[PDB]
Homo-oligomer: A and B are copies of this chain.
Amino acid sequence: MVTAHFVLIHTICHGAWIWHKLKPALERAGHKVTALDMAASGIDPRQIEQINSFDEYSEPLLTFLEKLPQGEKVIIVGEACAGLNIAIAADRYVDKIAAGVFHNSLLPDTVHSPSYTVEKLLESFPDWRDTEYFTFTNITGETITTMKLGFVLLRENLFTKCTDGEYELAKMVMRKGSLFQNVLAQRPKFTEKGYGSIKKVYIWTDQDKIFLPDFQRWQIANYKPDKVYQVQGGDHKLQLTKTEEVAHILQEVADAYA
């Protein structure tokens, strides 16, 4: 039974707080856990308007990996849009990464554009209901769209089965975010030697109400992971509704990729 160092990466608009129940669960099995806020997320001091690409949004993860001591490897667990943060970081630090784990997450490939799975998500789920949108121009002239997730979307689609205290916490600390979709459309594809070579484990539930079953099935078919684990029940936030199920699958990933 292997203990491991996990780096947990929240999705846009959220912050490390989404991992507050999974991080103790994991530490109870002896694992070391790091949960990072990405730029302008959680209590990071930057505003979204100063972030110019998804690669700049990933800076807390890249800096972390940058400083990881020689010879140490981590398992990066990313939720929803954070599959893009795993792919960005894996192209830069492939030798520091024992495995990438995708938790009801976007699963980028090497063959199509970095925005491809974002395009496919928005095709499967085009209406973000009461979500609001805004734009700014980044330092190079591109117009970036930000969003403030709507509370009906949060209650019914993202936190579908979460307790009222979890849902309320989400509304108390949620921040603006961006897909940087057009910037991703312009980004070079993820490399085969980096992202393409890491081990990939995909955790999902078909009860997810925003990364819907047919999109998740399309992603697995489009770019087969090494392992797919499906959890029965729960909702999009499996680390809150099926916390011990996720800590157990993650124990299997530690055993397998050390």
Contacts and interface: CB of A to CB of B under 8 A. Distances in A.
Interface of A: 15-17, 19-21, 23-24, 35, 42-43, 45-47, 49-50, 52-53, 55-56, 62, 66, 91-94, 136-141, 164-166, 168-169, 172-175, 188, 191, 193-194
5 nearest A-B residue pairs (beta carbon):
A24-B164, A20-B169, A45-B139, A21-B165, A17-B172
Contact of A137 (B43, B52, B62, B137): B62
Nearest to A52: B50
A49 B49 contact: yes
B191 A35 contact: no
A139 to B, nearest CB: 4
A172 B16 contact: yes
Contact of A92 (B47, B141, B175): B141
A42 B173 CA distance: 7
B91 A139 contact: yes
A222 to B, nearest CB: 23
A17 B188 CA distance: 32
Nearest to A62: B137
Contact of A168 (B20, B49, B165): B20
